[PDB]
Amino acid sequence: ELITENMHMKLYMEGTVNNHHFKCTSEGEGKPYEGTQTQRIKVVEGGPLPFAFDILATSFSHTFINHTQGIPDFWKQSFPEGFTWERVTTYEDGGVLTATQDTSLQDGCLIYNVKIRGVNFPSNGPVMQKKTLGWEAHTEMLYPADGGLEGRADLALKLVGGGHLICNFKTTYRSKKPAKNLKMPGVYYVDYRLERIKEADKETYVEQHEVAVARYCDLPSKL
């Protein structure tokens, strides 16, 4: 009843990649239960960025997952309290991005505060030469663990030349809401598709859209 069929969000992010500091912000909107969302991002500080903006794209929304099959919604359940997520992405060429997030509810609008932290990206790899062309769609595996939710996934980032560079996500979602107040979910999976719908001024303004669906596997079962 506090998460409605249309909401808004407003974001703020600060961080450092191989020691280039920047800050960013956005507003956005979508449909928490149809699973859809758009965000409008401007690098407000530290731009143009000397790295490809696709490494940051997965840091800008877990309230907007469309949840099929009575799978309880760890995320919509967390409010009004909200929730935090905390990650680490290891790229398969040495780059490690650690990110820590806070989602909170203030005035019908959802609020995101994120700190990014990047190091050891290779200086003639793609992130740093900006040879990248967006993320492929991906599936995240999820499973309660220790008072929160743990997530695990590999995404593939497309490159000029045609191959991909792979990366790992390790994520933990802890409730900003004392357990008693939340049913946990089994093991399950969320499928994403995150897309870049517009950029301008060498990525100092970006528009991003995402569809997410939660479901089980459907492979039958001899068990």
Side-chain angles (χ1 to χ4, degrees):
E1 59 142 45
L2 328 136
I3 309 321
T4 52
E5 135 201 346
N6 290 280
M7 324 175 102
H8 279 264
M9 348 139 222
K10 285 188 215 267
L11 189 143
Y12 179 79
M13 153 191 300
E14 189 168 350
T16 276
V17 185
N18 288 10
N19 341 248
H20 183 258
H21 163 289
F22 58 108
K23 291 218 218 37
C24 271
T25 78
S26 67
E27 341 251 349
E29 73 292 313
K31 312 181 191 307
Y33 323 80
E34 287 135 31
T36 51
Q37 72 174 309
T38 295
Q39 280 208 36
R40 302 185 279 286
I41 330 181
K42 301 170 179 182
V43 208
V44 315
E45 145 150 15
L49 303 167
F51 53 103
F53 188 96
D54 282 311
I55 64 167
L56 299 168
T58 70
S59 310
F60 282 89
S61 202
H62 284 93
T63 312
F64 295 81
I65 278 152
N66 172 337
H67 267 60
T68 60
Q69 316 192 195
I71 319 187
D73 188 318
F74 188 82
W75 294 285
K76 286 153 176 131
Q77 295 196 40
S78 250
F79 302 85
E81 280 63 5
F83 64 76
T84 69
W85 61 252
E86 162 169 357
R87 188 173 284 141
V88 55
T89 337
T90 310
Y91 287 76
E92 294 197 337
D93 67 2
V96 189
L97 212 90
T98 89
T100 79
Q101 200 280 21
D102 182 74
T103 307
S104 84
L105 195 65
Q106 181 38 101
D107 205 30
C109 203
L110 290 146
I111 318 264
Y112 299 156
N113 200 125
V114 186
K115 313 149 203 202
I116 293 291
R117 207 288 174 166
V119 323
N120 194 59
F121 281 92
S123 62
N124 299 78
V127 172
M128 298 307 310
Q129 296 302 291
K130 294 177 182 175
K131 276 341 194 197
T132 82
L133 286 205
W135 293 100
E136 292 293 353
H138 46 97
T139 296
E140 207 195 345
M141 168 176 79
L142 307 114
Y143 64 77
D146 200 3
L149 195 69
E150 289 260 312
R152 289 282 175 297
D154 308 72
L155 306 55
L157 168 65
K158 295 175 266 201
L159 304 155
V160 161
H164 307 57
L165 171 67
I166 295 18
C167 65
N168 209 237
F169 289 32
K170 297 153 155 155
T171 310
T172 312
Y173 314 90
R174 309 227 70 234
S175 203
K176 226 190 287 93
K177 165 181 255 196
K180 308 179 298 184
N181 274 312
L182 304 102
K183 200 159 156 217
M184 308 282 294
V187 146
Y188 61 115
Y189 313 86
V190 167
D191 279 307
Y192 303 77
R193 199 194 282 292
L194 188 160
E195 292 165 308
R196 142 100 44 99
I197 302 277
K198 171 149 198 257
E199 77 99 50
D201 297 319
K202 314 278 191 193
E203 298 184 319
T204 60
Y205 169 89
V206 184
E207 169 200 355
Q208 234 172 238
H209 173 90
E210 175 180 285
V211 39
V213 190
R215 63 163 165 70
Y216 296 119
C217 181
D218 349 30
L219 302 218
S221 169
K222 301 204 60 164
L223 291 175

